[PDB]
Amino acid sequence: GKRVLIVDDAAFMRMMLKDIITKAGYEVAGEATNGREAVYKYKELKPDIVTMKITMPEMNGIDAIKEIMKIDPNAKIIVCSAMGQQAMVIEAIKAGAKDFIVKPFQPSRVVEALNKVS
Amino acid sequence: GKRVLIVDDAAFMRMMLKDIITKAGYEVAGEATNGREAVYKYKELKPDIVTMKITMPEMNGIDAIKEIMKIDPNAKIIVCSAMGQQAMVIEAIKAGAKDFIVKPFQPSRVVEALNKVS
Ligand SMILES: [Cu+2]
Numbered sequence: 754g755k756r757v758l759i760v761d762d763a764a765f766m767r768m769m770l771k772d773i774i775t776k777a778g779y780e781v782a783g784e785a786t787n788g789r790e791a792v793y794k795y796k797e798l799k800p801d802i803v804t805m806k807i808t809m810p811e812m813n814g815i816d817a818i819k820e821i822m823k824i825d826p827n828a829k830i831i832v833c834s835a836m837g838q839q840a841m842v843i844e845a846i847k848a849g850a851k852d853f854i855v856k857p858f859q860p861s862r863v864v865e866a867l868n869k870v871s
Numbered sequence: 872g873k874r875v876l877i878v879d880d881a882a883f884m885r886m887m888l889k890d891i892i893t894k895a896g897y898e899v900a901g902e903a904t905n906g907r908e909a910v911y912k913y914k915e916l917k918p919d920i921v922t923m924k925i926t927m928p929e930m931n932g933i934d935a936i937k938e939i940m941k942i943d944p945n946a947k948i949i950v951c952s953a954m955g956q957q958a959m960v961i962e963a964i965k966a967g968a969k970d971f972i973v974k975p976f977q978p979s980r981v982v983e984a985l986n987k988v989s
């Protein structure tokens with residue numbers, strides 16, 4: 754599955770992600786900026802993969818992951834984290850996330866996380 | 872029409888071009904970098920729109936417009952020009968191009984032309 758839902762607080766982080774993943778042959782299905790928009794674009798876009806940032810306004814990433822799996826037990830979520838967010842990454846993996854990339858990431862490091870999950 | 876074939880020599884100009892047009896609700900049907908790729912790819916992607924740069928390594932923008940016009944007489948081509956390329960621009964309009972953008976890009980100016988060819 755080539756179609757990615759990019760969910761991120763920061764515009765600069767959505768753009769890089771758009772640019773790395775579409776370079777690696779993935780289709781950006783769409784984007785979102787908080788946890789509430791994330792779950793809605795997901796029902797809408799039925800993406801194969803989701804990249805989810807933890808720290809976001811209104812609804813944080815782990816709450817987005819939780820709702821997304823109750824909605825779809827088979828989602829494939831990669832969490833985007835900062836250094837020092839290791840505990841939160843764990844709660845993400847606990848809540849369903851299949852893997853994680855960390856900011857600032859190596860473009861190969863983002864591509865293989867994508868590849869490992871499909 | 873939402874799907875644009877962006878054909879430019881320089882990657883900086885395409886991603887930028889891709890960034891603006893995808894921000895305006897147009898979807899990058901694809902991209903190209905010389906006139907020969909411009910004309911295969913166009914049969915292939917059947918794009919509604921093409922943004923074509925004039926000076927290409929070895930198929931220049933103008934002959935791509937001519938070839939593309941024999942292929943599809945109702946194509947909608949926007950040529951990308953540098954400052955001082957008014958002569959080359961005219962031959963494009965002369966050869967079929969519907970409109971033109973100029974570098975350094977004005978976002979409202981780029982969005983305006985695209986809509987005009989609707
Ligand atoms: Cu809606």
Ligand SMILES: [Cu+2]
Nearest residue numbers: 793794797798
């Ligand atoms: Cu909607």
Ligand SMILES: [Cu+2]
Nearest residue numbers: 761766806833
């Ligand atoms: Cu991020």
Ligand SMILES: [Cu+2]
Nearest residue numbers: 768772886890
């Ligand atoms: Cu970009």
